[PDB]
Design goal:
The structure is cut from a larger assembly and holds one chain. By secondary structure, this protein is mainly alpha-helical. The chain has 2 helices and no strands. The N and C termini lie far apart (47 Å). α1 runs antiparallel to α2.
Length: 57
């Protein structure tokens, strides 16, 4: 995303394209971190339901 923004700055495009590409990259990275925390909380639930486990569960 930073390289693409530098490219766009070099091409002298309007700030509309700057914000479009920046928002796209930001939302993609938000999705990446959200999925990473999805897996992290999956593992955390595994750990809780494993360590904190007893019959009748």
């Amino acid at each position: 995303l930073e390289a693409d923004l530098a490219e766009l700055e070099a091409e002298g495009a309007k700030a509309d394209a700057r914000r479009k590409v920046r928002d796209g990259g930001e939302r993609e990275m938000r999705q990446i971190r959200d999925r990473a925390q999805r897996e992290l909380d999956r593992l955390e639930d595994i750990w809780s339901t494993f360590t904190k486990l007893a019959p009748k569960q």
